[PDB]
Ligand binder design. Sequence first.
Ligand SMILES: CO[C@H]1/C=C/O[C@@]2(C)Oc3c(C)c(O)c4c(O)c(c(/C=N/N5CCN(C)CC5)c(O)c4c3C2=O)NC(=O)/C(C)=C\C=C\[C@H](C)[C@H](O)[C@@H](C)[C@@H](O)[C@@H](C)[C@H](OC(C)=O)[C@@H]1C
Lengths: 351, 50, 50, 46, 151, 50, 150, 150
Amino acid sequence: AYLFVRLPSSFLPDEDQGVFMTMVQLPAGATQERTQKVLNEVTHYYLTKEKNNVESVFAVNGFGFAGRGQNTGIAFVSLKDWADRPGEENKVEAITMRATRAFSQIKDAMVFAFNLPAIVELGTATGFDFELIDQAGLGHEKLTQARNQLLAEAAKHPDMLTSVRPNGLEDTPQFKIDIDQEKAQALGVSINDINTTLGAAWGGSYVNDFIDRGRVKKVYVMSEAKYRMLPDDIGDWYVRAADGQMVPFSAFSSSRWEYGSPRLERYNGLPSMEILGQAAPGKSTGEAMELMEQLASKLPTGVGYDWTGMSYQERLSGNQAPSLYAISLIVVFLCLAALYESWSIPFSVML
Amino acid sequence: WGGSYVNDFIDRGRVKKVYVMSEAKYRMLPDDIGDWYVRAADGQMVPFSA
Amino acid sequence: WGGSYVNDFIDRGRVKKVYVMSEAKYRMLPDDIGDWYVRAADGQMVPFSA
Amino acid sequence: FVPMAFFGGSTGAIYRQFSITIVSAMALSVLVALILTPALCATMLK
Amino acid sequence: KVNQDGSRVLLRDVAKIELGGENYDIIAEFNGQPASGLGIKLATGANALDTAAAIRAELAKMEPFFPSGLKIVYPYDTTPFVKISIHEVVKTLVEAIILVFLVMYLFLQNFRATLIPTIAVPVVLLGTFAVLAAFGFSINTLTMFGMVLAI
Amino acid sequence: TAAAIRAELAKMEPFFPSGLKIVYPYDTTPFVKISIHEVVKTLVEAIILV
Amino acid sequence: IAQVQVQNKLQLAMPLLPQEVQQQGVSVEKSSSSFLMVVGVINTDGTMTQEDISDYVAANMKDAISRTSGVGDVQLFGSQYAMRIWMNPNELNKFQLTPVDVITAIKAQNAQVAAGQLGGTPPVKGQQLNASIIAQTRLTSTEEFGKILL
Amino acid sequence: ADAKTVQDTVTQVIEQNMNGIDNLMYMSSNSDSTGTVQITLTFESGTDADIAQVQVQNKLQLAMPLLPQEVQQQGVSVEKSSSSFLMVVGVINTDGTMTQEDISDYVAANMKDAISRTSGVGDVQLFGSQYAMRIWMNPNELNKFQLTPV
Ligand SMILES: CO[C@H]1/C=C/O[C@@]2(C)Oc3c(C)c(O)c4c(O)c(c(/C=N/N5CCN(C)CC5)c(O)c4c3C2=O)NC(=O)/C(C)=C\C=C\[C@H](C)[C@H](O)[C@@H](C)[C@@H](O)[C@@H](C)[C@H](OC(C)=O)[C@@H]1C
């Protein structure tokens, strides 16, 4: 009765499969050179410290598991054989743990390192997947702050073991360039001519194929690195007008910095915004979920929400257990009754 | 007379079609045809029945 | 020399192709290249040997 | 053993696996009990 | 272009020209040294293990013709676990039928009268695998512990 | 797959602009739910008269 | 399967279709014939009109209905919103212009333009700044479409 | 392309056509500020991937004529795999005789194409890149001689 109720439930036990991953998340828009620094720092920790376990570290900078960018990298750590690693200080369940606190310290950017849950291609990581959604074309701004609201309330209520975060949008400074169509179409310059130039040099162009060593490959016009790094470089590019006279960008352009998103997310066709979070040791997984919805009603108008991933597979599963065990009780009884020829003798073996 | 899909624009955040047509007037009867003038090499608008 | 496929036309209620290429007489030997001229910038026919 | 193969949901096909193996095999036990072990006892024993 | 005088201007005159990557977004390295690699994901519904057999079998065909000192090394890979994994459980499935031969000795005490219960255990099992096969199922972890429990 | 319709429409009601109403004009589905209730009725009567 | 064979044979025709039919339509799908239901939508108080609502449903509720469990096709009674230029020939011919000129102007003044980034793909060893360059952008307001220099 | 422009030009256009797809549960998507869409349709358990993929494709296809030439050019792609890596394959050179530049390229040109064709390999990722003819323009020169990148 108790003991049973004084026991936590679960799905399948984590296992040391002899391989694990390690993320590297830089503060959105940080140079790849800096992302290498982290990666190398990571590489060496494993290779030196855990040297007795880590047999190999394939560190890849630039590769986002759901977010390409300069501010992201991933490391594939493979350990030596299970044999050569006695005791739970040599299982991933701790090798990781230590590494997590080893980084997430001497840093500036966050470095999650973990073993992925066995038999759980999205299943039971006892968190939730709140998707925050815009439903009356509010806009990106509103939704950002509208989520900041929900995010900040969830802070006030830590009274249920939680870690409520977004999936790393966080707008970033970006450089606008407003071409003056008019100034151009008046200086005998064609907008197209302008457009290709800024583009092709600043974001390369894919022209056509060529053959390298019997394989077809691609040709790219683009600027050289050092004539496209800082905004005061747009100075370098002139563009030939119809009178042949070479006009510089600053004669049909103009610019100012601004904030914009380096990642727009949507769910079911609507601009959305994914929020993760959990219930660790404490309240029930459906209690947490509940709270979330309630303050998700507080959020400004036109803002809605929905459940995804694991939090979709909660509100469905067929038909429970002590119900399919009552139909077992009944069915076991009648069987014994059937055998023993009585209603009475069954209670001898069932007890 | 038919209209033409030209571009898309962003309406309140959702991509929508951008057309170009003609008021319903001068787009009905067989003499409306006349009302529309087509420019030329030199620079003169010519009556559609030229 | 190779033939090119311009577009379609309808022949007795059926869409069919329209090809366009040199009559066999002017496309046989290498010494036949000569025959072919191209209108240039200023508008004067130019020979291939050029 | 069978009422757990009727869980359904993402779990269900996890359990459905156990259930099946066990209820088969168990029938092969009952089947063998009547064929192999009865003879094979009276063919080798005491 | 050509220009007034005899001087002509080639592409090379206004741009470095070089063989270089389609895009420099992904720099890798295997223990801090220069690397590259294919990261492979499993076709939806495909059999993890069978597929890996092949990824390897293909690579096999490619090595004989690499350049000077180019080596395949195998960092991350889940495959060998699943293998070692289920096989460990298969071990704890033999040795358990061998350790039922002994307890049928401390209660029976005959060389050839101990078999009759222990030679009707791996009969019942071998036939499950067959019934598994008919009903389309796999030899998976869940399906092995299904048999150890069965013992 | 008609529950789904209304269970979705449900979902997108609250965000409607001032004074927007879903109406259900032509829907064949409450005919099903009756047609079947009736044939259950005849099943009990059928038992009754036996 | 029927869908598939049909789609497989349709491919053999596609090449031979007017490269304008191609440029647009050709759809193969599992047709029915009878609407299961007709969920209609009205306004109680003049804040909305035919075009007003017939676009609410178009751009707010169709996509998700047309995507819900068990749902076949979805015929929308009315039409979604479009930026509408209704041309005047007299005002046109007056300033010496053809609808071309207009289409051109629109194609030129409303359109989203790519433009690379500072601290690009491969950077010069130094380098410590990386962000997007945002060039030309799309026009959103009945008003901005008003100001298209012609 | 920049995140908003990716979205409002590729993404939106694609989603908008996703419909009449059997057993569709939900549909999430990202638009990177690299310039990278990833629309991903999750299907009810038990669904036939082969078909799910078919239907997803038949819709993409209607949109196709609407994506910028630039995006078609790069090739949009529809795959059916697990999010997770089955395995990583490493390639290094022990002479030290090849670069990171070269080993990526060797790999690409010589090893990638067959593994990806291997049945069961739902996705492949190249850690690095194949070569291309790189014309790193210099804009001063370009001016010296009175030439644009056009
Ligand atoms: C429970 O899920 C976990 C593991 C899944 O397993 C695994 C194998 O499959 C994954 C799936 C299916 C994802 O969809 C995913 C993801 O969407 C994501 C990151 C992480 N990327 N970071 C690395 C670099 N850079 C690309 C951005 C940030 C991931 O690694 C994964 C991921 C892999 O890890 N998110 C992003 O890329 C973006 C755009 C923004 C995220 C910003 C913040 C920083 C993160 O949200 C932090 C706070 C945490 O949420 C994660 C670290 C989770 O770990 C924990 C402890 O919470 C992780 C999702």
